[PDB]
Amino acid sequence: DYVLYKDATKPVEDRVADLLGRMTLAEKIGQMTQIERLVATPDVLRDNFIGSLLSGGGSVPRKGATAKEWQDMVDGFQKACMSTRLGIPMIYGIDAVHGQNNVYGATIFPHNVGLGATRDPYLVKRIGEATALEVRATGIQYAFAPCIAVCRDPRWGRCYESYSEDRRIVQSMTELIPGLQGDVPKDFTSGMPFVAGKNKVAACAKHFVGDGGTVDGINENNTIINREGLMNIHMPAYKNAMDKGVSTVMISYSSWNGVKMHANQDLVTGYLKDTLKFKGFVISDWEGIDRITTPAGSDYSYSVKASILAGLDMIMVPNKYQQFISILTGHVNGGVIPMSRIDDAVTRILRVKFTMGLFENPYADPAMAEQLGKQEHRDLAREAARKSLVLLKNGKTSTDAPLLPLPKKAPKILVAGSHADNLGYQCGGWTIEWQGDTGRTTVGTTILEAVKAAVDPSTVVVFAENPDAEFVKSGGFSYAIVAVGEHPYTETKGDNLNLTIPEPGLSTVQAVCGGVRCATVLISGRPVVVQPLLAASDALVAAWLPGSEGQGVTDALFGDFGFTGRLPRTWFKSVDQLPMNVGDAHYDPLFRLGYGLTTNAT
Numbered sequence: 001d002y003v004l005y006k007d008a009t010k011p012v013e014d015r016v017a018d019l020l021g022r023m024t025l026a027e028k029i030g031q032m033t034q035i036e037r038l039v040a041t042p043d044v045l046r047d048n049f050i051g052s053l054l055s056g057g058g059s060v061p062r063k064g065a066t067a068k069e070w071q072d073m074v075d076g077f078q079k080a081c082m083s084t085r086l087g088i089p090m091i092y093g094i095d096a097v098h099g100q101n102n103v104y105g106a107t108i109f110p111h112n113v114g115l116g117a118t119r120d121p122y123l124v125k126r127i128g129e130a131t132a133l134e135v136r137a138t139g140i141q142y143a144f145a146p147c148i149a150v151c152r153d154p155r156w157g158r159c160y161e162s163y164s165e166d167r168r169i170v171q172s173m174t175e176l177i178p179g180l181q182g183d184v185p186k187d188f189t190s191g192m193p194f195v196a197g198k199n200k201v202a203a204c205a206k207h208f209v210g211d212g213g214t215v216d217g218i219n220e221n222n223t224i225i226n227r228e229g230l231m232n233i234h235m236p237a238y239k240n241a242m243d244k245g246v247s248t249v250m251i252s253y254s255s256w257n258g259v260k261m262h263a264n265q266d267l268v269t270g271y272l273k274d275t276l277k278f279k280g281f282v283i284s285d286w287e288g289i290d291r292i293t294t295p296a297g298s299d300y301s302y303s304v305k306a307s308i309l310a311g312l313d314m315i316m317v318p319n320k321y322q323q324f325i326s327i328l329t330g331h332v333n334g335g336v337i338p339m340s341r342i343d344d345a346v347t348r349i350l351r352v353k354f355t356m357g358l359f360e361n362p363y364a365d366p367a368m369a370e371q372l373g374k375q376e377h378r379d380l381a382r383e384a385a386r387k388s389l390v391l392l393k394n395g396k397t398s399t400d401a402p403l404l405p406l407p408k409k410a411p412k413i414l415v416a417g418s419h420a421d422n423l424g425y426q427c428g429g430w431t432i433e434w435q436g437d438t439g440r441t442t443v444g445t446t447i448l449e450a451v452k453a454a455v456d457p458s459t460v461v462v463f464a465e466n467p468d469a470e471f472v473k474s475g476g477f478s479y480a481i482v483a484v485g486e487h488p489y490t491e492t493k494g495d496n497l498n499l500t501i502p503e504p505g506l507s508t509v510q511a512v513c514g515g516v517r518c519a520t521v522l523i524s525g526r527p528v529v530v531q532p533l534l535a536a537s538d539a540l541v542a543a544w545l546p547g548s549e550g551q552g553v554t555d556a557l558f559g560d561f562g563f564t565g566r567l568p569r570t571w572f573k574s575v576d577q578l579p580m581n582v583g584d585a586h587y588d589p590l591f592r593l594g595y596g597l598t599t600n601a602t
């Protein structure tokens with residue numbers, strides 16, 4: 001017989017309907033199952049008809065693996081999936097959230113908070129375009145990005161993953177989506193999924209909804225706000241995402257007024273699917289369904305029932321697939337979950353797969369391997385890092401000479417601080433490892449390396465990680481650049497009620513700035529207690545988490561370009577003010593949202 005779903009010339013909806021009508025319950029539930037590469041084998045993928053795989057943070061084939069190694073791994077998994085009766089290709093997902101960040105040698109872009117500081121949606125679109133290429137360089141077809149959380153309290157460990165506390169800025173930055181996926185056609189229906197083809201990736205608007213609204217910024221906690229507030233702060237960017245054809249949406253671990261997002265039928269089905277007319281697939285977060293219950297995982301049968309009935313389509317299991325499949329099959333066999341619900345979930349998963357061309361190009365393109373870490377992409381990351389920088393102070397007092405820009409020619413200069421020569425620190429979380437890491441973890445340029453690359457050949461550059469006051473005072477330095485701040489963190493590990501930088505940080509700044517005029521570069525995922533740093537410093541720059549391209553920092557420090565970044569968040573006076581956002585009745589910032597000093601290029 002002619003087999004319609006295998007015919008590339010046929011309309012997506014026709015191909016979807018034709019395939020679905022041929023599938024067994026096992027094949028259907030298989031599609032709904034996403035597993036870690038760590039538990040995947042060819043036999044597992046074939047025998048369970050698995051629909052998707054992912055790499056969680058740090059889930060890599062080998063340390064330092066090449067783009068070709070990634071492609072071969074993904075293709076090996078694909079070969080097993082394509083060998084099933086129906087030959088439905090799997091989709092492979094990864095957190096490419098500031099470049100293809102799990103991958104050695106991948107360009108690492110500034111994290112979202114810094115991108116918000118640029119107020120440049122086209123820049124962010126271009127980052128999406130570069131990121132898609134580097135993801136496809138590794139054979140991967142699906143990025144879990146953008147995070148369109150609106151972080152309302154910087155005590156949250158994921159505040160750096162939010163473009164802004166201002167939903168309007170977050171909405172503007174949804175341009176990442178057509179960068180990753182390609183621009184939607186003129187004739188496009190909001191809520192339909194879209195991916196242009198094999199050189200683009202499926203995107204994921206996350207985490208639905210109100211992940212940035214939790215009490216005290218406690219990660220995965222309760223967002224207590226009325227529907228009006230939910231709809232005017234936390235929801236708007238999802239509509240923009242719909243308009244731009246985002247292929248998938250990931251559900252939040254958080255709760256809204258005490259109801260777990262992973263169990264919320266009203267919002268997932270009633271709003272996202274039925275009101276926004278989202279036609280892509282809805283994916284859980286990692287063990288998200290497990291965490292519906294307290295303790296987590298204490299009634300997995302309930303978890304499966306609650307999440308599938310709420311309207312989730314694909315479950316990021318990610319390990320215990322046999323149990324997931326067994327429980328879901330049982331619920332269907334028992335009449336507890338209707339076939340219509342399974343058919344809806346599979347319709348959505350297949351729609352995204354057919355739409356993106358997965359059935360036509362299930363395997364990697366070896367010619368794309370060379371896209372990884374391309375200099376053109378690094379030049380883009382360098383531009384972004386520079387544009388993200390916010391100048392908070394430039395001259396110890398209002399009558400002082402402006403410190404920045406600094407001269408490239410001077411007899412001797414000092415570069416200092418825990419963050420001056422630490423690539424892992426300047427990248428932050430979601431870089432090589434889930435939580436990020438310390439030291440030379442990938443290919444890049446540290447602040448020290450950037451300084452050495454920028455200055456006149458006659459200028460002697462001295463590095464001291466934590467020099468004492470006497471070393472600085474007696475050193476014969478013209479000026480110092482001192483870089484300090486937060487260590488890398490991700491999710492709950494980043495939750496922080498005090499928001500003061502680790503030591504030595506302030507002590508180093510005080511020692512250096514006490515001995516010579518100094519420019520302090522603050523590396524952080526968020527505003528942190530800054531008055532003491534300000535007091536010691538002649539100039540201070542909030543550099544956020546600028547990524548692999550340290551020359552973005554020096555491009556502004558030495559005046560090749562002027563400072564243009566503006567705060568995308570309120571800078572508080574103290575943590576006891578929190579939460580405190582622009583528009584609040586009590587608004588007493590140290591620096592308001594939108595604050596930023598400027599310089600002109602030399």
Ligand SMILES: *[C@@H]1O[C@H](CO)[C@@H](O[C@@H]2O[C@H](CO)[C@@H](O[C@@H]3O[C@H](CO[C@H]4O[C@H](CO)[C@@H](O)[C@H](O)[C@@H]4O[C@@H]4O[C@H](CO)[C@@H](O)[C@H](O)[C@H]4NC(C)=O)[C@@H](O)[C@H](O)[C@@H]3O[C@@H]3OC[C@@H](O)[C@H](O)[C@H]3O)[C@H](O)[C@H]2NC(C)=O)[C@H](O[C@@H]2O[C@@H](C)[C@@H](O)[C@@H](O)[C@@H]2O)[C@H]1NC(C)=O
Pocket residue numbers: 438487488489493494495496497498499500501502503504
């Ligand atoms: C304000 O709140 C902050 C968050 O709540 C808090 O930071 C946390 O402090 C706790 C200690 O109570 C840390 O937990 C421990 O971490 C130890 C190792 O920590 C190092 O390595 C990790 C990465 O693995 C980094 O994230 C850390 O920053 C730290 O880095 C090291 O820091 C040194 C000092 O600056 C550097 O010289 C060094 O180079 C650097 N090394 C690296 C690799 O970067 C573990 O050994 C412990 O076992 C413990 O881990 C916890 O164990 C309990 C378990 O439940 C947790 O899951 C597990 O995390 C925690 O890492 C840290 N969180 C951060 C930084 O994100 C502030 O504490 C201050 O700063 C820290 C760095 C310490 O110096 C504290 O003494 C100090 O008080 C809070 N500040 C205030 C004012 O109270």
Ligand SMILES: *[C@@H]1O[C@H](CO)[C@@H](O[C@@H]2O[C@H](CO)[C@@H](O[C@@H]3O[C@H](CO)[C@@H](O)[C@H](O)[C@@H]3O[C@@H]3OC[C@@H](O)[C@H](O)[C@H]3O)[C@H](O)[C@H]2NC(C)=O)[C@H](O[C@@H]2O[C@@H](C)[C@@H](O)[C@@H](O)[C@@H]2O)[C@H]1NC(C)=O
Pocket residue numbers: 118119120562563564598599600601
């Ligand atoms: C010395 O520095 C100052 C301060 O940075 C320069 O003036 C700024 O120039 C920017 C670029 O032209 C102006 O930004 C633009 O603003 C308009 C109107 O709002 C807007 O339509 C543009 O899109 C752009 O806004 C940016 O868009 C991209 C975003 O990423 C970014 O956040 C937005 O700012 C900016 O308003 C202006 N600031 C002020 C206070 O005047 C100045 O540049 C010189 O003057 C400006 C007015 C312009 O004629 C430039 O061509 C000119 O060089 C600079 N001086 C020199 C000589 O370099």
Ligand SMILES: *[C@@H]1O[C@H](CO)[C@@H](O[C@@H]2O[C@H](CO)[C@@H](O[C@@H]3O[C@H](CO)[C@@H](O)[C@H](O)[C@@H]3O)[C@H](O)[C@H]2NC(C)=O)[C@H](O)[C@H]1NC(C)=O
Pocket residue numbers: 218220221222255258294
């Ligand atoms: C928002 O965060 C708070 C604070 O973490 C959460 O409350 C906490 O809930 C946990 C269980 O999820 C409690 O810990 C447990 O305690 C029992 C002993 O009674 C122990 O057997 C378990 O091993 C576990 O340690 C904890 O007591 C509780 N903390 C507080 C301060 O109430 C809350 O559930 C979160 N809300 C949401 C919606 O996620």
Ligand SMILES: OC[C@@H]1[C@@H](O)[C@H](O)[C@@H](O)c2nc(CNc3ccccc3)cn21
Pocket residue numbers: 055056057095144206285286287491
């Ligand atoms: O890495 C996959 C997802 C990621 O896309 C989400 O943005 C993020 O919320 C996320 N967190 C985890 C891991 N969470 C976890 C849960 C229970 C135990 C250990 C880790 C996985 N993921």
